[PDB]
Amino acid sequence: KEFECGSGECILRAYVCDHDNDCEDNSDERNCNYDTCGGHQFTCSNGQCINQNWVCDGDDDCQDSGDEDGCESNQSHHRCYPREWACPGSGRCISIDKVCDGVPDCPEGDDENNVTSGRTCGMGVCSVLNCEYQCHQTPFGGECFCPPGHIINSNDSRTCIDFDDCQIWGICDQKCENRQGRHQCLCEEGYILERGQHCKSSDSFSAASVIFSNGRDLLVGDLHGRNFRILAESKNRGMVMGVDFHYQKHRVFWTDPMQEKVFSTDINGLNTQEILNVSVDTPENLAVDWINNKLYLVETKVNRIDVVNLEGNQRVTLITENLGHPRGIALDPTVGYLFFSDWGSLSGQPKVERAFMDGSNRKDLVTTKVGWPAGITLDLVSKRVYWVDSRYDYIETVTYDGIQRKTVARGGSLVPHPFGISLFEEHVFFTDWTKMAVMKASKFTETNPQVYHQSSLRPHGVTVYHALRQPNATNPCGSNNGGCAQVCVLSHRTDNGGLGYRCKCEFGFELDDDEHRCVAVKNFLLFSSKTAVRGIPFTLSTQEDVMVPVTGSPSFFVGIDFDAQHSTVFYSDLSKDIIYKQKIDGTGKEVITANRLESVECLTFDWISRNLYWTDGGLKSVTVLRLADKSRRQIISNLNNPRSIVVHPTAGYMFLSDWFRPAKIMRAWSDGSHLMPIVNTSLGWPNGLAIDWSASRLYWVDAFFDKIEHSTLDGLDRKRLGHVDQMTHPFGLTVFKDNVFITDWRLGAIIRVRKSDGGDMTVIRRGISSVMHVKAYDADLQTGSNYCSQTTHANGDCSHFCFPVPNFQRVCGCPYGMKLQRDQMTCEGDPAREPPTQQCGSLSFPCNNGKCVPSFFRCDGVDDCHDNSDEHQCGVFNNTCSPSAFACVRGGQCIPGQWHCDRQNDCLDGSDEQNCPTHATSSTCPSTSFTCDNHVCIPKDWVCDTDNDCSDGSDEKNCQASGTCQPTQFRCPDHRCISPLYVCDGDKDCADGSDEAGCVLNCTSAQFKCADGSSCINSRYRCDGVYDCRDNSDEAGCPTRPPGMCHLDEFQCQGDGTCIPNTWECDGHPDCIHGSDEHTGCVPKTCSPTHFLCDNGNCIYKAWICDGDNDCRDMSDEKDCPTQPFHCP
């Protein structure tokens, strides 16, 4: 029943102690039952718990607007603090004692004398104002100031009312209070107060040290910069990028993106272990969880944030949605928060995010005027975050809720390009790619950086090694692993119903229905792209991956298929020309095959008989290989442009698509015999194939007609699915349950449609680069039995290959160079018909691995065979190195030529960097350009833009804030001088967008302008079927097909009303369902007597008939005449 408020209204109970009046009496707030609020909630001044996303949304959700409190920074700076004065011109709050001191401290000279506007430093009115404490002269009149604890009253400019000066920024380190004697600073336990205002760490916790990346090797130094010791040197041309430490374990961690590894040592410099080396191909930054003894990592080849134990086991992914470009990370295990930043998501907006320490409740903490947030650190006692930016070039701080945003340094002269940041006591230590040094700055307000240590190479993440940097706390997962089966990851202290932890499962498993139990994963979507092979769940809500992504240093992954009986996946790489096998957890990468592959465009698995089929676009064939033994034989030999294959183990059929001009889809026994077409009418570019295991129906897609079709295994009952919007160039297709997951090339995205009609196109992924394939991993589908895998039998009783055949029968075969025995079951040597041949021919070094490379690549310093065979034991008196490589003077070692004299020692003897011709001749860069110190040539407009272009910093030195620039440059307000190419480009390159404000969208006569004037797009994208404009004006007004008819230049099939292009009409091939396009009203083509033409191929010279080359593409020039020259040469 409704509550009876004192006013008489019947009030619903949901507002009882909602921290709102709800009526006049406020009796609903008389007694309150609220809790401490959740981690995903903000607490108002009244104690109200409101949603975290409502903070700084622009609406005063809490009474007194406690939820905004100046979310914006660089305000007009009105009502400056007591003992501070506002400059009328620039709005700059400056110290009162600096007014009329002789220094034009404000940029406009507002605190000094000038005659042009009658504001000299003369005293006029303070004699009558008579301030109760002190009256001082200003260029704009007399002003009054008061002792601490009061604010000058503008009501009369005489009095001062009481005020808490403790609120002002930088008054004291750590916390402060007004309890007695007005303001009174205080220091947290473990710290001791010094100077009255400063909090210093007690000497009971040992001296502090700061470890920073020199840019090539990890260093360590004292808190003043007297003695720097190289703790660890990166070997194999590596480079230390991120650094973090675990104090209790006396451990220092770092990441090496050029070696694609992460490491760990003691501070003594001993006991080094290589933690991770799989799938970590560009680790940016790092963070340890000293409370749960865990390591949080950031990867940016496939953007994700991971967590792993200090020994590198039980890796689990936490955040993988929408990251785009994550760079910074920081932790507060005592509270349970995880802070990270990215300089651009998959969407357009850069941001700084906050989340629980296992993902979960993500929230955009800072979203306005962000730029490129490059690094995050936390003040653990003041509960504030500190981050830097490399485009707007500032260092800012906000509280844990992002409320009070205050700049601590701003300007292209002070912080030109920060990367890393960490604070200690009264200082913040940040790095710099432009000033090339680790900088020390105050944490409250800083106007001049001090060079802590100046490098000759770009520095990287910095952390301060000290005990207080990692305060103690209780560990919720500290016993029984928190009841979690595999891995216990801390959440926010209030999450999981007060337990403070949530259970995860390693990549091979997933959580049970009742939680706390990890069972093997049954199914997930598996897709491939040029950068990585990934596995994602079908449920869109659980957007996190369920298998360690497969990545390589060169990589182009095309064809993929799995193996459920061993949790193993197969994948082809188009740059190695190699096929690999790898488990779901990332262990056991072994080459399946590397010999004689040109471009394998697909794989499939005949799981019952353990056969792997693949299609080669360079050899123009499909090969089958067994996994019990490395048997292989080209079962089909003379295709034209074959693409995705699929095999039906129980039915015994295999299906593959050729997209040459007479495109067709063929069916054959799993042996490779009976290859006949089943669909070859009205097909253009049949990229994808799949089988609907629930009904034994074959699905395929087209890229010429942009259609999806499905038929039975015989090609009968051919039906088209509905129109799918924005489907322009589908390549991959798979079928699961009642949905069809399709890869597309124009979108570069994975879309899902219903299996029974066109369906609702719901996008699963987007912006996944050159995405190629997709498979539906399922641990059930891969099951069954037939005569090739039957108990009481060995692989169907056939020596080597056994192949299923339609109508439940087995047919044996076996590899190249072996024919079938008389009994049709076993095999015998066949040297006469299929002689053995070498791994690969001459002019090619046969690697120990199957692959082989040209002999020019042997002993040249680059790992070409991908197993180091071509570099094995070089430099000896015969195995000389190639001239493209530099040979060390002794020792039989040699390196790529580009490493010779590159200021980095590689040769063991050190001859790599000796006697180099260091001096450059009397030569200059062109006169319009600029010459760096190291003689790099750059356009003059790049000078002083706060981006290091010379890689030396010579184009950014002597960059004073004097306001001048070059004539051609565009100057932002007090930020930097932009080159004129970056103004009016649609992106705010200044701190305020002034380089983009008020400029015309002048599309250059070859671009289509969106109707709303938001942007111009290239004319090719006009009306192609994909919405390229935000207003969808791109696809508006496009020419369309007249109702039921065809376009002006598309012949119509009289059989079914479809349209085929005019160039297909009377081409000799019956495209239409009934051959209407090959009516009698046209005559076949003929050829000259010196040439010959096949059934549909172009005419060719009579001289190469029967020659053994598929000149016609129709093989009829050879099948009409074997004519074997069966005689000795």
Partner 1 sequence: XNXXX
Ligand X SMILES: *[C@H]1O[C@H](CO)[C@H](O)[C@H](O)[C@H]1NC(C)=O
Ligand Y SMILES: *[C@@H]1O[C@H](CO)[C@@H](O[C@@H]2O[C@H](CO)[C@@H](O[C@@H]3O[C@H](CO)[C@@H](O)[C@H](O)[C@@H]3O)[C@H](O)[C@H]2NC(C)=O)[C@H](O)[C@H]1NC(C)=O
Residues in touch with partner 1 (CB under 8 A): 556, 558, 574, 599, 601, 617, 641, 659, 685, 687, 703, 772
- Please state the closest distance from residue 1094 (CB atom) to partner 1, in A: 23
Per CB under 8 A, which of residues 656..695 are in contact with a second copy? none
CA pair distance 358, 346, nearest whole angstrom = 21
Which letter, b or e, does each residue of 10-31 get, where b requires 16 or more Cβ atoms within 10 Å of its Cβ? Answer: ebeeebbeebeebbeeebbbee
Partner interacting with residue 597 (select from a second copy, ligand X, partner 1, none; CB below 5-8 Å by kind): none
CA pair distance 301, 15, nearest whole angstrom = 49
Location of structure tokens 């910069």: 225
- Please state the closest distance from residue 779 (CB atom) to Ca ion, in A: 35
- Please state the closest distance from residue 835 (CB atom) to ligand X, in A: 9
Does 812 participate in binding a second copy (rule CB under 8 A)? yes
CA pair distance 154, 146, nearest whole angstrom = 12
- Please state the closest distance from residue 798 (CB atom) to a second copy, in A: 10
What residues form DSSP beta bridges with 885? Answer: 896
- Please state the closest distance from residue 477 (CB atom) to ligand X, in A: 18
Of the pair 34, 808, the CB lying nearest a second copy is at: 808
Of the pair 809, 931, the CB lying nearest a second copy is at: 809
Does 4 participate in binding ligand NAG (rule CB under 6 A)? no
Does 1000 participate in binding ligand NAG (rule CB under 6 A)? yes
Among 539, 842, 927, 928, binds ligand X (CB under 6 A): 927
Partner interacting with residue 468 (select from ligand Y, ligand X, partner 1, none; CB below 5-8 Å by kind): ligand Y
Partner interacting with residue 599 (select from ligand Y, partner 1, a second copy, none; CB below 5-8 Å by kind): partner 1
Of the pair 9, 830, the CB lying nearest a second copy is at: 830
Does 314 participate in binding ligand NAG (rule CB under 6 A)? no
Of the pair 633, 752, the CB lying nearest a second copy is at: 633
Among 596, 720, 766, 900, binds ligand X (CB under 6 A): 596
Does 844 participate in binding ligand X (rule CB under 6 A)? no
Residue type, 876: V
Among 91, 411, 471, 817, binds ligand Y (CB under 6 A): 471
Site string for ligand X, 850-869 (x = CB under 6 A): --------xx----------
Helices and strands, counts by H and E, the chain:
2, 83
The region of 330-338, 464-472, 483-491, 885-893 touching ligand Y under the rule CB under 6 A is 464-472
Q: How far from the centroid of its chain's Cα atoms is residue 692's Cα?
A: 33
Q: How buried is 179 (Cβ within 10 angstroms: 0-12 exposed, 13-18 middle, 19+ buried)?
A: exposed
- Please state the closest distance from residue 635 (CB atom) to a second copy, in A: 14
Q: Which residues are CB-neighbours of 530 under 8 A, at least 6 positions away?
A: 555, 556, 557, 769, 770, 772
Among 809, 855, 884, 1062, binds a second copy (CB under 8 A): 809
| Other C-beta atoms lying within 10 Å of the C-beta of residue 717 | 9
Among 787, 886, 970, 1008, binds a second copy (CB under 8 A): 787
Does 914 participate in binding ligand X (rule CB under 6 A)? no
Cβ atoms of 629 and 670 closer than 8 Å? no
- DSSP state at residue 59: S
Give the C-alpha distances (Å, rounded to integers) separating 619 from 1, 36, 77, 616, 636.
80, 69, 72, 6, 11
- Please state the closest distance from residue 509 (CB atom) to ligand NAG, in A: 21
Give the number of residues written for the chain: 1129
- Please state the closest distance from residue 590 (CB atom) to ligand NAG, in A: 11
Of the pair 310, 820, the CB lying nearest ligand Y is at: 310
Among 8, 30, 35, 348, binds ligand X (CB under 6 A): 35
CA pair distance 269, 883, nearest whole angstrom = 39
Does 157 participate in binding ligand NAG (rule CB under 6 A)? no
Of the pair 831, 1042, the CB lying nearest ligand X is at: 1042
Among 1087, 1095, 1120, 1123, binds ligand X (CB under 6 A): 1087
Partner interacting with residue 793 (select from Ca ion, a second copy, ligand NAG, none; CB below 5-8 Å by kind): a second copy
Does 793 participate in binding a second copy (rule CB under 8 A)? yes
Partner interacting with residue 839 (select from ligand Y, ligand X, partner 1, none; CB below 5-8 Å by kind): ligand X
Q: Beta strand pairing status for 1007-1009 and 771-778?
A: unpaired
DSSP, collapsed to helix, strand or coil, labels residue 53 as: helix
DSSP, collapsed to helix, strand or coil, labels residue 954 as: coil
Of 882, 833, 820, 822, which is closest to residue 857 (Cα–Cα)?
882
Torsion of CA 708, 712, 718, 721, to 10 degrees: -30
Partner interacting with residue 161 (select from partner 1, ligand X, ligand NAG, none; CB below 5-8 Å by kind): ligand NAG
**Chain contacts with Ca ion (rule: CB under 5 A):** 15, 18, 20, 22, 28, 57, 59, 61, 67-68, 101, 103, 111-112, 393, 417, 706, 728, 857, 860, 862, 864, 870, 899, 902, 904, 906, 912, 942, 945-947, 949, 955, 982, 985, 987, 989, 995, 1021, 1024, 1026, 1028, 1034, 1064, 1067, 1069, 1071, 1077, 1107, 1111, 1117-1118
Through-space distance between the first and last CA atoms of the chain, rounded to whole angstroms: 106
CA pair distance 231, 358, nearest whole angstrom = 32
Among 95, 399, 711, 839, binds ligand X (CB under 6 A): 839
Partner interacting with residue 471 (select from partner 1, ligand X, ligand Y, none; CB below 5-8 Å by kind): ligand Y
- DSSP state at residue 167: G
CA pair distance 631, 861, nearest whole angstrom = 34
Of the pair 480, 927, the CB lying nearest ligand X is at: 927
What residues form DSSP beta bridges with 712? Answer: 697
Of 508, 521, 525, which is closest to residue 736 (Cα–Cα)?
525
Of the pair 380, 663, the CB lying nearest partner 1 is at: 663
Cβ atoms of 944 and 953 closer than 8 Å? no
Among 21, 43, 74, 153, binds ligand NAG (CB under 6 A): 153
Does 966 participate in binding ligand X (rule CB under 6 A)? yes
Q: How far from the centroid of its chain's Cα atoms is residue 721's Cα?
A: 34
Location of structure tokens 């590198």: 312
Does 348 participate in binding ligand X (rule CB under 6 A)? no
DSSP string covering 192-228: EEETTTEEEE-GGG---EEEEB-SSEEEEE-TTSS-E
Cβ atoms of 814 and 801 closer than 8 Å? yes
Of 457, 439, 460, 438, which is closest to residue 448 (Cα–Cα)?
439
Among 304, 466, 493, 810, binds a second copy (CB under 8 A): 810
The region of 563-571, 724-732, 870-878, 997-1005 touching ligand NAG under the rule CB under 6 A is 997-1005
Give the C-alpha distances (Å, rounded to integers) separating 227 from 58, 167, 210.
50, 39, 11
Of the pair 17, 1003, the CB lying nearest ligand NAG is at: 1003
DSSP string covering 1081-1107: TS------TTEE--SSSPPEEGGGTTS
Question: What is the chain's alpha carbon radius of gyration, rounded to the nearest angstrom?
Answer: 36
Site string for ligand Y, 161-200 (x = CB under 6 A): -----------------------------x----------
Which letter, b or e, does each residue of 1004-1022 get, where b requires 16 or more Cβ atoms within 10 Å of its Cβ? Answer: eeebbbbeeeebbbeeebb
The encoded tokens of residue 302 equal: 């496939």
The region of 404-412, 709-717, 750-758, 822-830 touching a second copy under the rule CB under 8 A is 822-830
Cβ atoms of 359 and 319 closer than 8 Å? yes
Does 824 participate in binding a second copy (rule CB under 8 A)? yes
Site for ligand Y, rule CB under 6 A: 190, 204, 467-468, 471-472
Residues binding ligand NAG (CB under 6 A): 153, 155, 161, 274, 277, 1000, 1002, 1005
